[PDB]
Scaffold this active site. Structure first.
Site, PDB file in Angstrom:
ATOM      1  CG  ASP A   1      85.802  60.723  68.839  1.00 56.89           C
ATOM      2  OD1 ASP A   1      87.029  60.622  69.164  1.00 56.89           O
ATOM      3  OD2 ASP A   1      84.910  59.889  69.119  1.00 56.89           O
TER       4      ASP A   1
ATOM      5  CE1 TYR B   1      82.977  53.587  63.925  1.00 60.14           C
ATOM      6  CE2 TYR B   1      84.206  51.839  64.990  1.00 60.14           C
ATOM      7  CZ  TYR B   1      83.701  53.161  64.995  1.00 60.14           C
ATOM      8  OH  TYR B   1      84.042  54.000  66.100  1.00 60.14           O
TER       9      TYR B   1
END
Ligand SMILES: Cc1cc(N)c2ccccc2[n+]1CCCCCCCCCC[n+]1c(C)cc(N)c2ccccc21
Length: 574
Positions: free
Chosen positions: A292, A370
């Site tokens: 990530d 998101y």
């Protein structure tokens, strides 16, 4: 025959052996706290006080011979190595020309980080998580955060594991520059300094060994002397319960991405890749690695970092290099390992990586659909919408328009479909994309009716600040609220609004909101309708499935709607 061996239980560490040595009652550098052995050293003391002792001993596990050695008079220590964790019925026999005599059987435990010595975890799941028969090809993922065991009081045995295919464990740090961790406050940066003492920069470590493997959880049957405890022992027991579950360490995240910017230098990638191999050989319940990096090219937590030219090729090389290393582990273990990454989906994030190249190495891309709007500024909008909302200006959706000041939009607006289409158009296969759902809202205060340019739509208003609240309300930081908080404090059971909030839905965007017109409190989130829309969209485009951030903030409603929206669907796995 010889006198039968009598096992000295206390002389043999009461028959508890572990392939992993984990420091307890202290916090120090990772390489001082964690030591793994490919074989357990088994040492069992026995005695034969009466009679003849014989010449040789044999050790049996579940009636199969596993070791042999010499008898040394009246007291012998059987020492041997053993690779396979588990619980075994052990007998020790003594032999000479006259015959053989054997001890009574006693249980020996050999602990290993696959959980092979553990019974299936006892679960304590909120019964609002319902049962589905979603096809097993579809990804149903979520993140479980290491720190959620504190104030959030959400432990591994709370996860609705039958409803998940993939659990991403947030988050494993990389030693090195990590100023962004100071923004979490508290002990987090200092705990990382401690973990990285004696560790080379660019190697992974466990950030919180208390939560990971020291804390005794009574629901898991942990005792203070148990050799592996914490979240990790519960994850091992969870894998015994649900063996087809994939549990994947998530490396980085918003807070912990600062070291990735130095992966332009291959020497730091080599150090990192080797450390991850080591990590996966140490913690065998893990099934791959998730990267990530937020984000190649910048735009993350570190305002002084990011290289639009060089980070994409660094990211692609990282994936190529990780996949070479995971192929090694597959050769070595016979297992299959996955490589995944969560990525930004704003056009300015996607433009900095040639995903057509990277994705050949990867099983899944978790698209972070998101955080598109939020309390970091005072502009309302839909934080997790599929499509452009009513509030957007002409030309804002595709980026050809101009803003209220006459200034060109720089790219398409932040919506899930604008990002997913940019990835599809460059040749990323739909079946490697996983769409993100939010189990939380973002919000503002001060959005009072007088601020709206369209009276029917609070996303046309203006805020004065972040939503404020207490942790009992699910507000762990200003501007952000757990979904289970929005349900208890704003929606109510019937979903029609309590405490002065009203519910609304932008049917064009596929995005819900609650708004209290008195306080100007406005919260953008995902709900049953908008997650059904995401499932339908995922079936329509042949995406791999859905994931969510973060499981502790759901009450079951969002994961249930993720399954409901995918009913009937199958996908070709990568
Ligand atoms: C609490 C907690 C506790 C821990 N022990 C911990 C330990 C390690 C890492 C995180 C930890 N965390 C924190 C985990 C944080 C998870 C979520 C971080 C994303 C935040 C949204 C990012 N964001 C976006 C996208 C866009 C913006 N314009 C923007 C502007 C300002 C600020 C942020 C913005």
């Amino acid at each position: 025959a010889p006198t039968a061996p009598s096992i000295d239980m206390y002389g043999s560490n009461n028959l508890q052996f572990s392939k992993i040595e984990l420091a307890m009652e202290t916090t120090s550098g990772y390489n001082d706290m964690v030591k793994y052995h490919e074989l357990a050293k088994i040492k069992v003391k026995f005695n034969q006080w009466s009679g003849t002792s014989g010449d040789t001993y044999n050790v049996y596990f579940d009636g199969v011979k596993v070791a042999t050695g010499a008898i040394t008079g009246s007291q012998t220590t059987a020492s041997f190595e053993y690779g396979q964790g588990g619980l075994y019925q052990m007998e020790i026999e003594a032999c000479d020309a006259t015959g053989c005599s054997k001890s009574a059987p006693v249980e020996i435990t050999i602990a290993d980080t696959d959980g092979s010595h553990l019974k299936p975890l006892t679960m304590n799941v909120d019964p609002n998580n319902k049962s589905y028969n979603t096809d097993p090809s579809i990804v149903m993922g979520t993140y479980f955060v290491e720190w959620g065991i504190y104030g959030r009081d959400y432990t591994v045995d709370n996860m609705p594991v039958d409803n998940l295919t993939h659990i991403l464990y947030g988050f494993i740090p990389i030693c090195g520059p990590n100023e962004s961790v100071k923004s979490v406050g508290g002990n987090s940066f200092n705990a990382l300094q401690t973990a990285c003492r004696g560790v080379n920069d660019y190697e992974v470590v466990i950030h919180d060994p208390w939560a990971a493997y020291q804390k005794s959880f009574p629901q898991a049957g942990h005792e203070y002397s148990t050799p592996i405890k914490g979240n990790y022992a519960m994850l091992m027991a969870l894998k015994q319960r649900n063996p087809d579950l994939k549990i994947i360490p998530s490396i980085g995240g918003w807070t912990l991405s600062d070291p990735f910017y130095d992966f332009v230098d291959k020497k730091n990638r080599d150090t990192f890749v080797a450390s991850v191999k080591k990590f996966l050989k140490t913690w065998k319940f893990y099934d791959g690695v998730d990267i990530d990096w937020e984000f190649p090219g910048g735009g993350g937590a570190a305002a002084d970092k990011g290289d639009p030219v060089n980070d994409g090729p660094a990211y692609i090389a990282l994936m190529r290099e990780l996949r070479v290393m995971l192929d090694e582990l597959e050769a070595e273990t016979g297992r299959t390992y996955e490589l995944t990454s969560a990525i930004g989906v704003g056009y300015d994030k996607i433009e900095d990586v040639d995903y057509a190249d990277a994705v050949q190495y990867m099983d899944y891309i978790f698209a972070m659909t998101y955080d598109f709007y939020g309390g970091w500024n005072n502009v309302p909008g839909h934080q997790t919408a599929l499509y452009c909302g009513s509030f957007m200006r002409p030309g804002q959706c595709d980026g050809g328009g101009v803003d209220e000041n006459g200034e060109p939009y720089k790219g398409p607006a932040y919506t899930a479909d604008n990002g997913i289409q940019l990835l599809l158009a460059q040749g990323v296969p739909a079946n490697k994309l996983v769409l993100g759902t939010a189990m939380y809202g973002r919000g503002w205060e001060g959005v009072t009716p007088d601020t709206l340019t369209d009276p029917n739509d609070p996303m046309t208003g203006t805020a004065t600040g972040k939503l404020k609240g207490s942790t009992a309300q699910g507000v762990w930081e200003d501007g952000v609220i757990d979904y289970k908080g929005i349900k208890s404090f704003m929606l109510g059971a019937n979903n029609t609004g309590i405490n002065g909030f009203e519910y609304g839905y932008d049917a064009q965007a596929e995005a819900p909101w609650v708004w209290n017109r008195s306080t100007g409190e406005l919260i953008t989130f995902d709900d049953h309708r908008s997650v059904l829309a995401k499932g339908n969209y995922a079936k329509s485009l042949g995406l791999a499935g859905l994931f969510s951030w973060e499981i502790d903030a759901d009450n079951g409603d969002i994961l249930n709607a993720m399954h409901e929206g995918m009913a009937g669907g199958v996908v070709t796995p990568p």
